[PDB]
């Protein structure tokens, strides 16, 4: 359940990172057994990236990918995947191209607290049309809704089984609100271009994130509402949800207009009230999925596989999604393990 504010409420008035790449299978590799080949890219900025899955020196045709999301430091991450049956001879790899790379990089395949978060990304495409807008919603480490301006439906779409229950009134409202979020970010891109005296031909990125945390008693803990321009902090709500943090003089002008209009009070009402109310509904409707704990199957490199949630403690490689709701991790040098699903 997204924020529902009027158009003029969140309108603005006034560092490239190279991707980390991981290639792996969802399950342990077994000849003749259907599996999924994954290429997890993360920690990169800007969002434009070209990812290919290679089989025996040629591109794999039907490759799907996850919806664009980003981490607390505003860097993006994506999962590229495809179904495959590995055999003895076949060799697989991932090729990644990005503005930070002088040439495409190839990586071979070596064979009870809760939260609700919404992530919004809008990237300007001068001349090539309206900005590319992608919105995703999370409950804990599970994506459940999405919106892509380039997709055909022009609707908010389900990405979890427990959200498909919701009726047309729900989807109409979320579709209406996410389109308003997009309209806000499009205007903000044009506004921010002028405030920084930037050329109309350059591509720029606007990012918005907000959500709420609850404890094991499902009572409100903390709320967030943050905003970034080109991967850098612009304006954010402080932990108390009544005052703002601005980065530079352009964001300080926005801060004053929002303080006079009492924008923080409207966001506080959503984050402390509406956000927790629908998070509780989601945790109930998806209890079989969201309230489960999956213990890590364990097997100097320490392995941990097929666990949920992603929080875990073990060269340390980033925790990665398996593509089926579970996660993976390994660490290289006794090995210490800590997870919520294991006594």
């Amino acid at each position, epitope marked *: 359940y997204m924020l529902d504010l009027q158009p003029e409420t969140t309108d603005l008035y006034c560092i490239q990172r190279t991707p980390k790449i991981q290639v792996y299978s969802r399950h342990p590799a077994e000849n003749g057994k259907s599996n999924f080949l994954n290429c997890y890219v993360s920690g990169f900025h800007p969002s434009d990236i*070209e990812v290919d899955l*290679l089989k*025996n*020196g*040629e*591109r794999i*045709e039907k490759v799907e990918h996850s919806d664009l999301s980003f981490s607390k430091d505003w860097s993006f991450y994506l999962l590229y995947y495809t179904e495959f049956t590995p055999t003895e001879k076949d*060799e*697989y*790899a991932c*090729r990644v*191209n*990005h*503005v*930070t*790379l*002088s*040439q*495409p990089k*190839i990586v*071979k395949w070596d064979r009870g607290s809760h939260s609700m978060r919404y992530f919004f990304t809008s990237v300007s495409r001068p001349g090539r049309g309206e900005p590319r807008f992608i919105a995703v919603g999370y409950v804990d480490d599970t994506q459940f809704v999405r919106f892509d301006s380039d997709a055909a439906s022009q609707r908010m779409e389900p990405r979890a089984p427990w959200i498909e229950q919701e009726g047309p009134e729900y989807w109409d409202g979320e579709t209406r609100k996410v389109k308003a979020h997009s309209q806000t970010l499009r205007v903000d891109l044009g506004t921010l271009r002028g405030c920084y005296n930037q050329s109309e031909a350059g591509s720029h990125t606007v990012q918005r994130m907000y959500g709420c945390d609850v404890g094991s008693d499902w009572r409100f803990l903390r709320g967030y509402h943050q905003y970034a321009y080109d991967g850098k902090d612009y304006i954010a709500l402080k932990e108390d949800l009544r005052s703002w943090t601005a980065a530079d003089m352009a964001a300080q002008t926005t801060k004053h207009k929002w303080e006079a209009a009492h924008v923080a009070e409207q966001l506080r009402a959503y984050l402390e009230g509406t956000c927790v109310e629908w998070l509780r509904r989601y945790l109930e409707n998806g209890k079989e999925t969201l309230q489960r704990t999956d213990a890590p199957k364990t097997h100097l490199r320490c392995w941990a596989l097929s666990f949920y949630p992603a929080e875990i403690t073990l060269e340390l490689v980033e925790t990665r999604p398996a593509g089926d709701g579970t996660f993976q991790k390994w660490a290289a040098v006794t090995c210490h393990v800590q997870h919520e699903g294991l006594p």
Partner: nanobody
Amino acid sequence: EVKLVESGGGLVQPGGSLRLSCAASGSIFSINTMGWYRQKQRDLVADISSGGSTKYGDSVKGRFTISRDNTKNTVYLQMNSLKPEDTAVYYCYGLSYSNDDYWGQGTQVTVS
């Protein structure tokens, strides 16, 4: 191990054409996909597998055509309707059947 011999670049007037060629050395069982990128980063122009599966960059679709002579492990890039924005160094590349990439020195292409 693998050597990529490039040829076919140079100067051309707007609307003119050019045919790049890239020949791979070594055994024919050593290179699968062959193609071109063009110049910080380099962008995909066109490539083709041994079986003939082609892929084109968005900014050259319709104008550029890649083809292959499997009997000689050599690919050709027919560049039609060239524009000043096509001016770049075009780098030939090849992928082994174990996903090892090989890169040529590149050929400058300039459009008046």
